[PDB]
């Protein structure tokens, strides 16, 4: 009450009071939920935090139990804020990457300029991201700070994973040479989470078969219909068997 729009941001002023009533330990997480919810525009009436304060400042009387004309759209906005509070606690993602997932969804594999999703395919990648961060251990801050910038390299991530640096280099090379959807480009090889998750699946398949990633690449080059253009010789099967 008594808020000037010019002096401060609405969502940052409103973030302590949202965290006070959504049972959030952090005001920064509450600011993330308000930024997220402005991208969703939840409810029947497409609710933004600016529309939410215009309703409170004009039409809401505190303590009165009456029917305001657009009260049910406000409730759906507050039901949404509690939903995304639950998304944060259930996925186990940390506070700073949840900023990054709200503000830069493309860095987590979403389309360009797209609002993020609390889809079940998007909840499963936040959990697999949070499991990925927790596996990094004490070097997880150095990876996420280099992931928030575009400075994350294969040599740096392999140090935190206790892998060989040439293993993630060769896994990145075989990911860029093969037809992935979405593609793995040297620009985003360690910038997007989808590309990082793709490169690590070259690592996990190679560790399972106890081969190098180019041994896996030799194996997927023996695909029957992919090699109806250039048929592999018996020697290429004989080398891949060895």
């Amino acid at each position: 009450q008594g808020f000037d729009k010019d002096k401060a941001d609405l969502l940052h002023v409103m973030a302590p009071y949202i965290a006070a009533t959504l049972q959030l330990s952090s005001e920064n997480v509450a600011h993330s939920v308000l930024l997220w919810a402005d991208k969703l525009q939840p409810g029947d009436g497409a609710m933004t935090a600016e529309k939410f304060w215009d309703w409170l400042n004009t039409k809401y009387t505190p303590g009165s139990s009456e029917a305001v004309e657009t009260q049910e759209h406000i409730v759906q906005y507050c039901q949404a804020l509690a939903q995304l509070e639950m998304v944060y606690h259930s996925t186990g993602i940390n506070e700073n990457a949840f900023r990054l997932f709200v503000t830069k969804p493309e860095m987590f594999g979403a389309a360009t300029g797209a609002a993020p999703a609390h889809d079940a395919l998007s909840l499963i990648m936040l959990t697999r991201f949070a499991d990925w961060v927790n596996a990094l251990g004490e070097k997880a801050s150095s990876v996420l700070a280099a992931f928030e910038a575009n400075s994350l390299t294969a040599e740096q991530l392999a140090d935190a994973m206790n892998l060989d640096a040439n293993l993630l280099l060769q896994a990145s090379i075989q990911a860029q040479n093969h037809q992935h959807l979405p593609p793995v480009t040297p620009e985003n090889a360690f910038s997007c989470w989808t590309s990082i998750n793709t490169i690590l699946q070259w690592v996990n398949v190679a560790q399972q078969l106890n081969v190098a990633p180019q041994g896996v690449s030799a194996l997927v080059g023996l695909d029957y219909i992919q090699s109806m253009k250039e048929t592999p010789t018996y020697a290429q099967w004989e080398n891949a068997a060895g």
Binding site: Q23, S25, E27
Partner: protein, 97 residues
């Protein structure tokens, strides 16, 4: 064991229904941290008012005692008043000398 399950559930139902539950202290912390930050801007304002009185009773404008960073937002602004109370004690010691 079915009694212990029901006894565990009664303690869990007690922690959620008591007045001094977690939802109270989320409300208390979220509201007080909003008050404490707004009260911080008011008290630094008068620490700067006392410095302007120090700069006017003595001819000096290059002499500053209230320096930024009493509020550390990463630590919720804790020890902001202890930092300013030291800064007020450095004006008064400089005034007496």
């Amino acid at each position: 064991l079915k009694t212990q399950q029901e006894q565990t559930q009664s303690q869990l139902a007690f922690l959620q229904r008591k007045f001094s539950n977690q939802a109270l202290y989320n409300w208390l912390r979220g509201r007080l941290a909003a008050i404490y930050f707004q009260f911080y801007d008011l008290a630094v304002a008068r620490c700067l008012m006392a410095e302007q009185a120090y700069r006017w009773e003595l001819n000096d404008d290059s002499a500053r005692f209230i320096k930024p960073g009493a509020w550390q937002g990463t630590y919720a602004g804790l020890l902001a008043g202890e930092t300013l109370m030291l800064s007020l004690a450095q004006m008064e010691d400089a005034h007496l000398k």
